[PDB]
Structure formats: C-alpha cells, structure tokens
C-alpha cells in the first residue's frame, strides 16, 4: 500500500514513465537507436539535442495540458531526466499567481 511519502516517488515515477515513452517516440521518429532512459541521465547524453529537448518538453506539455514556468523558468536547469520530470511531478499545487492583476490587489491594500 502506498503512503504520502512514497506517493512522491509514485508521481515522480509516473511522469518519468511518460517522459521515457516520449523520448522513445522522438528518437524513433527521427530514426535513431533507442537509448535506455535513466533518471539521472542527461538529455544530451540520451541523444536529445537543444531543439529535441524543447520538442520533448512540448510533447509532454501536449499530454497534460500544463507547463510550469515557475521553477522551470530556466531552460538551463533542464539537464537530466529528473530535472524535467521534477517540474511536472509538482503538478496539482498552487505555486505562483495565475493572474498578476489580482495578485496586485492582494499587495495593494491602499488607495
């Protein structure tokens, strides 16, 4: 039986499996040999180039319909599989304010 603590691993594994399938899709479509996706592996090491990495993200975005720019604001922080998976693993929790105008109303307590 799963616990809250192990659920963090489950959700991380969940997005990992998704990413793995998408990586195989990318390399498979391009006609390149499918490399084994290790969680601590670098996308560039798996065979994903700068453009392919961006494509991989978009392929995952098109799955969930979500894409956090909060923590994943720095594309250079997306190096290993765990880095990209981490971003989408933290899905379901309100982080930044979706609207900056109402966020302004929260700060602006004066006239």
> For residue 31, what are its two tokens?
């006609």
Give dist(CA 86, CA 91) in Å, integer. Answer: 9
> For residue 73, what are its two tokens?
């604001």
Give dist(CA 47, CA 34) in Å, integer. Answer: 9
For the chain, helix, strand, coil in percent to 5 are 60, 0, 40
The answer to whether 94 and 102 have CB atoms below 8 angstroms apart is no
The answer to whether 81 and 43 have CB atoms below 8 angstroms apart is yes
Q: How was this structure determined?
A: NMR
SS3 call for 102: helix
Give dist(CA 42, CA 49) in Å, integer. Answer: 10
């Amino acid at each position: 039986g799963i616990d809250p603590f192990t659920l963090n691993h489950q959700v991380m594994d969940q997005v990992f499996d998704q990413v793995e399938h998408q990586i195989a899709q990318v390399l498979g479509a391009k006609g390149g040999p499918l490399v084994a996706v290790e969680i601590d592996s670098r996308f560039s090491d798996l065979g994903l180039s700068s453009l392919d990495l961006a494509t991989l993200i978009s392929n995952l975005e098109a799955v969930y319909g979500t894409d956090p720019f909060a923590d994943a604001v720095a594309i250079t922080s997306i190096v290993t599989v765990a880095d990209l998976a981490r971003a989408y693993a933290q899905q379901g929790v309100p982080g930044p304010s979706p609207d900056p105008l109402d966020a302004q109303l929260r700060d602006l307590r004066q006239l």
